[PDB]
Amino acid sequence: NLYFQGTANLTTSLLGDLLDDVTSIRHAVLQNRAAIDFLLLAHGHGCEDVAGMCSFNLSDQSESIQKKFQLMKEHVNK
Amino acid sequence: NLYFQGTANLTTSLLGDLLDDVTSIRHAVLQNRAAIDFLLLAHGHGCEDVAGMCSFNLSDQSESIQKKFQLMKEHVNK
Amino acid sequence: NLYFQGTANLTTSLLGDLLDDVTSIRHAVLQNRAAIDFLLLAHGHGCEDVAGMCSFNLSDQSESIQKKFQLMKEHVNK
Ligand SMILES: [Cl-]
């Protein structure tokens, strides 16, 4: 039981760290895309000239992921 | 038992969301790299002039990850 | 018991793959940011001119994540 609880808690702990890292990376990718679009403007080109550069709507399921994560912690660590 | 099953199902649910987000981010990073390489060309430079810019072969274990994920769901949610 | 062990092992296996992919992606994002900063220099602009471009300190909890992952494997697969 406590062995099970130990496995589950390691998993939530690790997942917490990983989710924060992934959030950080998405943030950075979007900043980078905006920088690229400024450079394209500087060359007299619009974002529509390069595949994907107009798009800032990446998959972002933070809301459902964070809710599930919280439920998981409450479920596991009670 | 159902408590165990509940933990495991929350984990597969969350992981599903996270895998889709990571796929999305890798996609975007590669598009961004291609855009950078077009700009370097515009300046009269090749991708070999900037560290890593020639490389589009990121770690992509989607095939093994997706198989494991499917096995995990079938194993857990039966 | 072995069913539990099977679930847990699938989870560590999948997580191992995913962590390597995320590491790879962060690497790439940082290389891309450096490339963008070289292009900004080429245009006579510093990184402070574009949001986030001076920053190479993304969330990187690889040390704690890798330790937890190793503990998880030892805990689960013993
Ligand atoms: Cl990027």
How remote is the C-alpha of C46 from its chain's centroid?
A: 27
Compute how many other C-beta atoms are within 10 angstroms of the C-beta atom of residue C19.
18
Residue B45 CB-density burial (10 A; 0-12 exposed, 13-18 middle, 19+ buried): middle
The pair of structure tokens assigned to A35 is 């920088």
Residues from chain A that touch B3, judged by Cβ atoms under 8 A, are 75
The pair of structure tokens assigned to A12 is 């939530």
Cβ pair C36, A35 in contact under 8 A = yes
d(CA C25, CA A29): 10
Cβ pair B12, B74 in contact under 8 A = no
Nearest to C29 by CA among B61, A58, B25: B25
Chain B residue at shortest CA distance from C35:
B50
User: What is the distance in A from the centroid of ligand 1 to the CA of A69?
Assistant: 26
Please report, as a single letter, which amino acid is at residue B2. L
Q: How many domains does chain A have?
A: 1
How remote is the C-alpha of C73 from its chain's centroid?
A: 19
Residues 6 or more apart from B4 whose CB is under 8 A from it? A4, C4
The pair of structure tokens assigned to A57 is 């709507």
What technique was this entry resolved by?
X-ray
Residues 6 or more apart from A15 whose CB is under 8 A from it? A69, A72, B14
Which residues form the domain of A12? 1-78
Residue B66 CB-density burial (10 A; 0-12 exposed, 13-18 middle, 19+ buried): middle
User: What is the distance in A from the centroid of ligand 1 to the CA of C32?
Assistant: 5
Residue the block writes with tokens 């400024």: A38
Residues 6 or more apart from B39 whose CB is under 8 A from it? A36, A39, A40, A43, C39
Nearest to A25 by CA among B23, B16, B40, B37: B23
Domain of C7, CATH number, reads 1.10.287.210
Chain B residue at shortest CA distance from C42:
B43
Cβ of C40 within 8 Å of Cβ of A39? The answer is yes
CA–CA distance from C25 to each of A44, B48, B66 (Å)? 30, 19, 18
The residues whose Cβ lies within 5 A of ligand 1, an ion, are A 29, 32; B 29, 32; C 29, 32
d(CA C17, CA B71): 15
Neighbours of chain A (3+ CB pairs under 8 A): B, C
**Data resolution in angstroms:** 1.8
d(CA B14, CA A15): 10
Compute how many other C-beta atoms are within 10 angstroms of the C-beta atom of residue B74.
10
